[PDB]
Design an enzyme around this catalytic site. Structure first.
Site, PDB file in Angstrom:
ATOM      1  N   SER A   1     -88.196  24.286  76.071  1.00 27.85           N
ATOM      2  CA  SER A   1     -86.640  24.418  76.062  1.00 27.85           C
ATOM      3  C   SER A   1     -85.787  23.487  76.001  1.00 27.85           C
ATOM      4  CB  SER A   1     -85.870  25.151  77.177  1.00 27.85           C
ATOM      5  OG  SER A   1     -86.443  24.372  78.451  1.00 27.85           O
TER       6      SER A   1
ATOM      7  N   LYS B   1     -79.711  28.073  84.591  1.00 24.58           N
ATOM      8  CA  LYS B   1     -79.339  26.572  84.182  1.00 24.58           C
ATOM      9  C   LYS B   1     -77.836  26.232  84.078  1.00 24.58           C
ATOM     10  CE  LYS B   1     -82.642  26.507  80.431  1.00 24.58           C
ATOM     11  NZ  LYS B   1     -84.388  25.460  80.615  1.00 24.58           N
TER      12      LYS B   1
END
Ligand SMILES: Nc1ncnc2c1ncn2[C@@H]1O[C@H](COP(=O)(O)OP(=O)(O)O)[C@@H](O)[C@H]1O
Ligand SMILES: Nc1ncnc2c1ncn2[C@@H]1O[C@H](COP(=O)(O)OP(=O)(O)O)[C@@H](O)[C@H]1O
Lengths: 140, 353, 89, 101, 101
Positions: free
Chosen positions: A47, A90
């Site tokens: 990611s 996140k």
């Protein structure tokens, strides 16, 4: 896995410059140290990759990135971006940091809308698929 | 007290108790077609087995192996056979095991010793010829500490099984009548000496349409009995299912669709017992409420395939998937109009050598 | 792999949604591959509408139930040049 | 110990192999003939290994399939012939021996 | 022919080697009923526990005699035809080398 991700993003950078600004040759002609601090678990490791390319480009042209543009994603070696997992934690981490813009792969437009509306106030999202989009949502 | 427990463990064991089989083929047909759809190949093999055992007199043991993508119903077919032949069933997972003593018990002089799992199966199943189902042979714990998988040959070898013995009660047992079966997601990891013995049947995947005919019969009613509902209150048209499988779950196995329909039913249960509807009726417009927004949509990411990318099928460890292959320049090409250096390639993507 | 490179070389796109597979010989012969049935169902899920297999496996693919194979348009091949003419032009 | 010539396997299986497996499936010779020609066809096509193990699997399979045609099926005496065979054990596996020509 | 001359029976070692499935084990057993010696298979493929060929000290809890004593106990003759298997693949590890054993 991060090493291949790094080389993938690297070659994509090398392609993006010659596709974009041939006169520069900073990337193909210079050594470069790059440091990603630990903390990401290996499974989410990829990611980080979408960040990587913008790092180099900022170093490449030398212009600073626009401030407080947090992002994540996964790069395809031909400019496609790919979904990442675990977005909600996140996004709150970005909230704690004072983030006021953010960019996610368009494929994850679903999960971001599950979030409670109070979580989403004050952020300013940009879903994207092909990487070139991000190039115009950071620099200019 | 130790020897008393030992006497008990010994006396329980059948020595010649033989659960009788049915052997007429008709009844085996009926009991097989009503339990598992399709996967006809394994049905045909078991049918031949039944056909031979009826000829050569007595009941017979045999080894077999199944392998394929997870969740195809392997374990499910096992029990269906178990009630088909009329043999007693007993699952026995061994994925990742390393205690050869677990497959063989303990010396009986050890404190707390108990016979290996099989003897527990003999005490419980009470037949001399049950349907043992070894699971996940591929994932057996294969360590330096004495590989049980080597120990398994003593059970599964057709000749060395005949006088198998275990450390708890030393006297050899005669397992020849047992009908072992083995299940592995991929056959190659299986250790070589063992691989040669067992027959290798191949359960397959399922076409997208095929899942439709699956779920309407053998799946929805199962979850319907798991959530405690009756059909009177929780109908699910087929159309909702075809939409599900086409969108929310891209897996050759049926496990993931099994998760969805489970979720939908249990939410329906909440709408019944306290909620509004006295009879929830999922309809395509309703469903996204229950299970949220669609997750997958853009199957096959690229569509125009920009130059230098090509699709490639791959017979991965589970199912099969249409992964792309991609390439690109890594330096300006005309570094010198005269340049003569081999355009060296650099492969990447977790190459094996 | 090879089609990738050649596509990159001339730079023209591959014909759309033409999945392929095989095993190359260093002189243009192609070789049998294993496990075809699972591969074919996976290609069906992706909306594939053409497909190419080593000619040596024209056998196993036809064992498949007729409903699995409806709607595909196969092109078995043995020498590699064959596939090249079934992809680009 | 050595390997075995293609022809040699015929003389092997015709005696020490088929009857043994015939006794494993519980049949008697009366009902499960296998002409020599089907065996040479097998060995020529469906199994290329110097050992006899793979042919041993094939003929075993063919016999037990015959058992299924007997115990409930139609024929009281299966008679394999090369035209019949692809039914029983399916399509040829190997064919293009020697890749290049 | 030689054992018949020099009086009593005599042992000897031999080795066979060749492609798998050539029938090796089958002649082993055939010899066992030819000479009339007792047969006893004993795989050693991939093993690494020398104690298996030699048992255990008998002071360890649960110690049991090595495999050979079991074969000698079972065939009840002093001169059986042991058949070591798969010498090629002996587990040659740090954990006590069988090859010395
Ligand atoms: N063709 C089928 N017929 C009936 N049930 C099936 C079929 N295919 C899959 N299933 C279902 O798949 C589920 C899991 O199958 P099983 O092999 O028993 O466990 P797993 O596949 O998870 O290892 C079962 O609940 C079973 O009902
Ligand atoms: N020439 C032959 N004569 C008799 N039997 C044979 C011959 N060749 C192969 N076999 C058969 O091959 C099978 C396996 O042989 P064996 O050496 O016992 O096992 P493997 O060959 O697998 O090591 C045996 O069942 C045997 O009957």
């Amino acid at each position: 896995v991060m090493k291949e991700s790094a080389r993938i993003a690297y070659t994509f950078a090398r392609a993006f410059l010659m596709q974009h600004a041939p006169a520069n040759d900073y990337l193909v002609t210079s050594h470069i140290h790059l440091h990603v601090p630990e903390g990401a678990t290996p499974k989410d490791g990829p990611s980080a990759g979408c960040t990587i390319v913008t790092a180099l480009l900022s170093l490449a042209m030398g212009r600073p990135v626009r401030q407080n543009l947090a992002m994540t994603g996964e790069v395809s070696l031909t400019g496609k971006i790919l979904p990442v997992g675990g977005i909600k934690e996140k996004t709150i981490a970005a909230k704690r940091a004072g983030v006021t813009c953010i960019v996610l792969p368009a494929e994850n437009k679903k999960d971001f809308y599950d979030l409670a509306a109070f979580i989403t106030e004050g952020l300013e999202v940009h879903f994207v698929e092909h990487y070139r989009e991000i190039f115009d949502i950071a620099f200019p | 007290n130790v020897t008393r427990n030992y006497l008990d463990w010994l006396t329980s064991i059948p020595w010649g108790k033989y659960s009788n089989e049915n052997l007429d083929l008709a009844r085996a047909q009926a009991v097989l077609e009503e339990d598992h759809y399709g996967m006809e190949d394994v049905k045909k093999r078991i049918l031949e087995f039944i056909a031979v055992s009826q000829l050569r007199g007595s009941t017979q043991g045999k080894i077999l192996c199944f392998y394929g993508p997870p969740g195809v119903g392997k374990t499910s077919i096992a029990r269906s056979i178990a009630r088909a032949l009329n043999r007693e069933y007993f699952r026995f997972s061994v994925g990742g095991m390393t205690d050869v003593a677990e497959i063989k018990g303990h010396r009986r002089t050890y404190v707390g010793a108990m016979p290996g799992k099989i003897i527990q199966c003999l005490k419980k199943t009470k037949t001399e010829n049950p349907l043992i189902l070894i699971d996940e042979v591929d994932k057996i714990g294969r360590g330096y500490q004495g590989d049980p998988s080597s120990a398994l040959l003593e059970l599964l070898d057709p000749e060395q099984n005949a006088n198998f013995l275990d450390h708890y009660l030393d006297v050899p047992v005669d397992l020849s009548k047992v009908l072992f079966i083995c299940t592995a997601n991929v056959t190659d990891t299986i250790p070589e000496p063992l691989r040669d013995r067992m027959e290798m049947i191949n359960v397959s995947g399922y076409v997208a349409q095929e899942k439709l005919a699956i779920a309407e019969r053998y799946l929805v009613p199962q979850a319907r009995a798991l959530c405690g509902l009756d059909e009177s209150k929780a109908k699910l048209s087929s159309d909702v299912l075809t939409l599900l499988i086409k969108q929310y779950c891209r897996e050759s196995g049926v496990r993931n669709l099994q998760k969805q329909v489970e979720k939908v039913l249990r939410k329906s249960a909440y709408k019944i017992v306290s909620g509004e509807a006295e009879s929830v009726e999922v309809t395509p417009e309703n469903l996204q409420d229950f299970v949220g927004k669609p997750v997958f949509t853009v199957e096959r990411m690229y569509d125009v395939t920009p130059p230098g990318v090509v699709m490639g099928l791959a017979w991965t460890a589970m199912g099969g998937s249409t992964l792309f292959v991609e390439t690109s320049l890594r330096r300006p090409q005309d570094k010198d109009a005269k340049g003569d250096k081999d355009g060296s390639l650099e492969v990447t993507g977790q190459l094996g050598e």
